[PDB]
């Protein structure tokens, strides 16, 4: 006897203003832990006959007791539309975006240090 992971889709609607299809995802995994998002993306790509790079899923909460999980998912028409319409952190979760490796304090102090210099020498402030 084998256990199965079941994927179900609800509240499917087609958003032509943002060029995507969005839905609620229900995952049945009676004995196991919460299914990772990558496997959900592969299964949903097999379900909807697309490549996994255009599927973005998030907001997965497991119910008390451990039977079911509920999340949200979007499938884009093309990868260009995904790169143009998605928020930057969801792109970064896929490895498409890289953020600044600094802190607010450093940038604020550097700006306030630049405020004291006039002319080309502004470029010389460390």
């Amino acid at each position: 006897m084998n256990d199965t992971v079941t994927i179900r889709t609800r509240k499917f609607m087609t958003n032509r203003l943002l060029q995507r299809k969005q839905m609620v995802i229900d995952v049945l995994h009676p004995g196991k832990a919460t299914v990772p998002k990558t496997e959900i993306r592969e299964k949903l790509a097999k379900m909807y006959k697309t490549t996994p790079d255009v599927i973005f899923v998030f907001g997965f909460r497991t119910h008390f007791g451990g039977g079911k999980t509920t999340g949200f998912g979007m499938i884009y028409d093309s990868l260009d539309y995904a790169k143009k319409n998605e928020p930057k952190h969801r792109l970064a979760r896929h490895g498409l975006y890289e953020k600044k490796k600094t802190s607010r304090k450093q940038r604020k102090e550097r700006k306030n240090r630049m405020k004291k210099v006039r002319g080309t020498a502004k470029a010389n402030v460390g």
């Binding site: 032509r16 203003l17 943002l18």
Partner: protein, 262 residues
């Protein structure tokens, strides 16, 4: 304050926007525009809260900056644009047209209209005056000014305007027996027939209305918008035909339906 205010607290926002309490501290302050702040629906609220096309304000901005949303036939990219009563909203990408009409609960309703109906709107005449070189001018409720109006049109009348050209096609006179909608007060969103008008010099006039079920109510003259000539409206109406129903008569109709079933 030392000048104009630029913020709006969420709990101090108009109640018909149906905003919840825990989303944030602030609400969208509408931009200045054709309609008043307390009697408008901002584009962001209509686009993400009523239609659920967007999840955040950034997605509303992304939708609007693609020049997809047209208001009264013109593309608007401002997400806090004040859209008001009898406004036409067109989205050709989804093939949808909407008209902002109050429901019986006093809120703007998601009312879809036919594309042929989307070519005109109704406006209430607010002012008539003679401008330079003796040219008559007419000012409507949505700040539209029109030159050379028909001499028969007076204040408190209704005109039908073609959106493409912005010109008057025909008009309805303010008279007893015409159909009207209430745009303010306790009877907001109720449709009926004008029965008589009471005049108070130096004060506010009072108008009496009766709906299709025979119920009578009264409002001030500034809260009435003439919709149709006779009993026939010149625009499509929402799901409720302007009749505000009570709990007792709702029980009565439920009992009638239960008796008629079987």
């Amino acid at each position: 304050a030392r000048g104009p205010k630029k913020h709006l607290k969420r709990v101090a926002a108009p109640k018909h926007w149906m905003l919840d309490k825990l989303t944030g501290v602030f609400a969208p302050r509408p931009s200045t525009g054709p309609h008043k702040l307390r009697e408008c629906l901002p584009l962001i609220i209509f686009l993400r809260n009523r239609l659920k096309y967007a999840l955040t304000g950034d997605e509303v901005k992304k939708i609007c900056m693609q020049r997809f949303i047209k208001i009264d036939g013109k593309v608007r990219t401002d997400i806090t644009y004040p859209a008001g009563f009898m406004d036409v909203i067109s989205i050709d990408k989804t093939g949808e047209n909407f008209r902002l009409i109050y429901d019986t609960k006093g809120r703007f309703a998601v009312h879809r209209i036919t594309p042929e109906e989307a070519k005109y709107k109704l406006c209430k005449v607010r002012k008539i005056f003679v401008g330079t070189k003796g040219i008559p001018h007419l000012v409507t409720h949505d700040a539209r000014t029109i030159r050379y109006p028909d001499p028969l049109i007076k204040v408190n009348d209704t005109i039908q305007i073609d959106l493409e050209t912005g010109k008057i096609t025909d008009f309805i006179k303010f008279d007893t027996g015409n159909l009207c909608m209430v745009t303010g007060g306790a009877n907001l969103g109720r449709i009926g027939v004008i029965t008589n008008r009471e005049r108070h010099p130096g004060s506010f006039d009072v108008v009496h209305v009766k709906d299709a079920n025979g119920n009578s109510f009264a409002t001030r003259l500034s809260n009435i918008f003439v919709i149709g000539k006779g009993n026939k409206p010149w625009i499509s109406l929402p799901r409720g035909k302007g009749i505000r129903l009570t709990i007792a008569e709702e029980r009565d109709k439920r009992l009638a339906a239960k008796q008629s079933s079987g």
